[PDB]
Amino acid sequence: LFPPNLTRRYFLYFKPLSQNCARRYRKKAISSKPLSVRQIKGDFLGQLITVRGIITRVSDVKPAVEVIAYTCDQCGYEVFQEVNSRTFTPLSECTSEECSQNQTKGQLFMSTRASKFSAFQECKIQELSQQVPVGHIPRSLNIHVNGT
């Protein structure tokens, strides 16, 4: 019926693998090992890593939509659309089985009272003075914060 994410009201987060646990059980911890914005290269894309730095910019909390809810003025049926990108295209015509069997051209209208939102913040992290090589300037890495 409805997408699973809509009913969810919890946020799942991962705590890195502490060095003590890794050394206890004879393993190497890649996630907890602190790095610098300089060392975050393309090879680390898609992994859980730790970054050490100084925050230099924060943004106001804004609602980022996760599941949009529409209402058909004819059926009385609600249509849910998942959004998982920086941009999305709103729906226009109803896709309900009622609008299909009757082939009515009902119009979908957005309703923010039933949608799902998650708090969003964008920040910047910069390297400390102890990590910049001589003759080089500090670099900045964007951080996205969602949930709690």
The residues binding DNA (CB under 7 A) are 89, 140-142
CB 64 within 8 A of CB 121: no
If phi > 0 it is left, if psi is from -120 to 50 it is alpha, else beta; for residue 27 that is: beta
What part of residues 75-114 is at the interface with Zn ion (CB under 5 A)?
Answer: 75, 94, 96, 99, 106
Of 95 and 104, nearer to other proteins (C-beta) is 104
Place of tokens 């502490």: 18
What part of residues 59-78 is at the interface with Zn ion (CB under 5 A)?
Answer: 72, 74-75
**CB under 5 to 8 A by kind: which of DNA, other proteins, Zn ion, none does 53 bind?**
none
Q: How far is the CB of 98 from Zn ion (least distance, A)?
A: 6
66 binds other proteins (CB under 8 A): no
Q: How far is the CB of 130 from DNA (least distance, A)?
A: 20
Q: How far is the CB of 35 from DNA (least distance, A)?
A: 14
- As given in the structure block, the two tokens for residue 98 are 């009622």
Determine which helix (DSSP H) or strand (DSSP E) holds 99, and give its type and residue range: helix 97-101
Cα–Cα distances in angstroms (integers) from residue 76 to residues 3, 7, 69, 114, in the given order: 18, 20, 13, 14
CA pair distance 75, 96, nearest whole angstrom: 8
What part of residues 96-125 is at the interface with other proteins (CB under 8 A)?
Answer: 98, 101-104
Give the interface with other proteins as residue ranges (CB under 8 A): 74, 98, 101-104
